[PDB]
Design an enzyme around this catalytic site. Sequence first.
Site, short mmCIF file in Angstrom:
data_model
loop_
_atom_site.label_atom_id
_atom_site.label_comp_id
_atom_site.label_asym_id
_atom_site.label_seq_id
_atom_site.Cartn_x
_atom_site.Cartn_y
_atom_site.Cartn_z
N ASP B 51 0.68 -1.20 -0.01
CA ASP B 51 0.22 -0.11 0.04
C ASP B 51 0.94 1.24 -0.12
O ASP B 51 0.38 2.40 0.25
N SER B 76 2.09 6.73 0.22
CA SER B 76 1.39 5.83 1.07
C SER B 76 0.14 6.05 0.87
O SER B 76 -0.97 6.77 0.83
N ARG B 77 -0.77 4.81 0.11
CA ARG B 77 -1.77 4.92 -0.60
C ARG B 77 -3.02 4.97 0.40
O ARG B 77 -4.03 5.31 0.28
N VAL B 78 -2.69 4.69 1.67
CA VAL B 78 -3.65 4.99 2.79
C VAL B 78 -3.88 6.63 3.21
O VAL B 78 -4.79 7.27 3.22
#
Lengths: 57, 229, 50, 50, 49, 50, 232, 114, 114
Positions: B51, B76-78
């Site tokens: 992620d 950070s894809r979050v």
Amino acid sequence: AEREAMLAKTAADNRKSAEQVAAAQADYEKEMAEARAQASALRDEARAAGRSVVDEK
Amino acid sequence: DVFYLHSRLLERCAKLSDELGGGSMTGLPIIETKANDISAFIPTNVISITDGQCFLESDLFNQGVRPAINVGVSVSRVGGAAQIKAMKEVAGSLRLDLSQYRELEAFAAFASDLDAASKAQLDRGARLVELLKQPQYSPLAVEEQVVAIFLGTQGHLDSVPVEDVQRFESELLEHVKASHSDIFDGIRETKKLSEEAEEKLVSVINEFKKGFQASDLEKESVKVRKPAP
Amino acid sequence: YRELEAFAAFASDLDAASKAQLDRGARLVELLKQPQYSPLAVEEQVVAIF
Amino acid sequence: YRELEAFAAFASDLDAASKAQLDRGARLVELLKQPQYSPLAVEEQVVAIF
Amino acid sequence: LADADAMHAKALADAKAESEKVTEEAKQDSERIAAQLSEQAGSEAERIK
Amino acid sequence: TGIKAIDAMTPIGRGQRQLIIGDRKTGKTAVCVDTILNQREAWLTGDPKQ
Amino acid sequence: TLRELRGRIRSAGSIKKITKAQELIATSRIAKAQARVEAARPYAAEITNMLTELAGASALDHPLLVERKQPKRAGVLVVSSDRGLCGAYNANVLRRAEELFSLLRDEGKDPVLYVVGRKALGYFSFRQRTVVESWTGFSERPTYENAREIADTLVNAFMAILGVDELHIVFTEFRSMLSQTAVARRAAPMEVEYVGEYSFEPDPETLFDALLPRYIATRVYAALLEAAASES
Amino acid sequence: PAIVGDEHYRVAQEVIRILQRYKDLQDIIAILGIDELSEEDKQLVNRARRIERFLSQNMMAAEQFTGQPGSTVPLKETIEAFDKLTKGEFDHLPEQAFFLIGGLDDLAKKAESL
Amino acid sequence: PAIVGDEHYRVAQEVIRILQRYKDLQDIIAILGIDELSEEDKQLVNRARRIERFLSQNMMAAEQFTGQPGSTVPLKETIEAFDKLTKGEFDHLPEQAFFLIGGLDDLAKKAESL
Ligand SMILES: Nc1ncnc2c1ncn2[C@@H]1O[C@H](COP(=O)(O)OP(=O)(O)OP(=O)(O)O)[C@@H](O)[C@H]1O
Ligand SMILES: [Mg+2]
């Protein structure tokens, strides 16, 4: 001689007033920055004392 | 199956639902790139399985940027969902801003006609880069992190010379931690940087900046045309 | 002399010491130059490098 | 034209012949452009290149 | 010129007063920093124990 | 993680999979060990949710 | 790796094209600058000739011809390029400027800098040495107007404002097409030269005083033209 | 820094910073040379070249090749010399003075020689 | 042009032309510097930077990457904005004003904010 001295004073005052205003500003800045430097040195001495006490303990 | 090998593993790191207990498992897989090539096979496999990235580059590490995160490549894809609201507010656009700063620095390396906006961006970016430097085994609580990033993102470091930023930050967080810890307590318990706390922090930063001490043969001649004077 | 000649190919001027080094190096190069199938006895080589 | 293209910025310092070559080449390049699905009969091509 | 003398004296007096205030604040902050470092030392000693 | 760069630009959430990727001796294990060490304050809470 | 290598090949090819084009354009501008240097030769020669003829009948008491009793400032004009890609040109000019500064300090003179060209502005700003006045935008193609302005400012600083007791000029002499050497000249005050062997209006003294600034201007113009040639 | 000390670590990291910046400028140096660099980068490149050449040493095992006797520089002297190099205290000496010299006294001797 | 229209095709293809020219120039700029480019090429580079940054958009799904909410640009507005950029009607605004805005109104607002 009176006219002469009058000219002389007109000359000095203007000069001395200008130079003294500049000197007052410069001296206030110098004293204030000296106070800041002393404060920073005191805080750094406190930091060093803290590091020393933590290391020793 | 080398891709499967990693996915089968990494995909088991998940945030379970409340029906399953609410547990979680965070994975920090570590990949060694060869010759700084993030575009190899296994690196890209893991990048696509995970992620986000923290692409630590040797070039940045040598340049003094520690932990050495390449801001542009890293992501950070979050994103903000994995940050407390104070940190999200203080650093919402920090990564893209730093990426743009790096692009500008590459572009503006030898440009002598820099605009005012471009130079302001370069200065803000350099101060942020210094602000993000961090020595090893020196963790910062999340409230300290939000205050630090607040110094740079809101522009309170724009007056500090770049080389002193690391000291400034380092000192201010202590001055707060020693004298104005109520800011840290508010951030920690509330997870938000309230307007009142933000105003207090700005006032504290200004009063500290007042006391902060920055480290700062031929001759031209005319021929008279007579043998002697 | 190799790097000195590379530098002198574009340097406007150099100190007399640099020019002397360049002159000596050109001559050493022209000296080590040797025709094929013409090996020199060791004493002849000593005299030439002398 | 492809040799002179580096000099497009500095046309004022070029020989009149070289400037003429560059100007002719730009227009020839524009001439060789052609919209899609619109082929030209050979006579039209001859007149165009003429 | 006269005013200048008065302003120089006033600037010196204000600088002295501000220096006193600054050094008082610096001593207070130094005491706070020393207290924090001593508490951190106590915490470190407790962790080691 | 306790590192400003990560917690600010590339935040790591619980349930996330963050890749630490880079050449030899670039700080990877340092980042991971710092992340592990930063959880002591949470462990001392005694609350499984933290 | 192959992708990076081919990208670098394309970049280097473009750079090669640009640099070869710059080389040829510089070869053109060397010819232009040398032609302009030769074009100013007649005016310099004849103004110098009539200046000598006037000095023959002049009082020689004009300020620009007498050393001050004890000079304390000295003006230095550093002529440098306003665009890069000139190799050591700016570096050599400013190295000789530093050598002139050392010579002045050995003589006790404090140097004060006027600079022509941005590349010298950068060097002096980096080392935090103040420049009284600067001119930019003509080092490649100087015109007599710029030379006249520079000479006027230098002369005005000389007659004085705090002013300067002496003024020099540092620039690259176009010694030959192959070699260019940075040189220093003390442009004022001038030594009066005597060598072994006319009428005037309105008198010799006023005419001589009015002509010396023109001589300063034309010599500064020659310096700028020759610096442009050396830059090219 | 917890093992080698603050000063040694700081000097080593400053040297590495200078050399890495020199490496970054490598293509520009190859094409246009030091002349087109900014003044900060120009100074940095000068002292980077001097640092890189001062890292060279006359090894005692190399006596069989160059005939020059080998040196040994104590760690304190190395740290001091490289601190001075990174601070520019030697950036006036010629680059040649730093080849295979091994020390500060030997550096001064070779500077006198040149 | 037979589907999207002549205006759309012209604007898109001029944008592609500018971006390709900028991509070719990047090699020159990185070493020789922008100051040595042609005036037309320098203007094109500025327009290309602005176009590259304007093609960025604050997307709805990326809200958690930028914090700011998503935005939608109608096709006519995109065509008009990029047409203006290609003719240089926004060369006076700073490039950072075009980054993650999504529309001309947002462009003006962010230009004011800068
Ligand atoms: N943030 C930091 N600040 C200062 N020094 C650091 C930092 N991070 C790492 N280092 C140091 O840099 C070197 C990197 O070591 P580290 O174990 O972090 O690297 P790694 O990625 O695990 O490498 P390896 O491939 O050798 O296992 C070590 O000296 C470490 O002490
Ligand atoms: Mg490791």
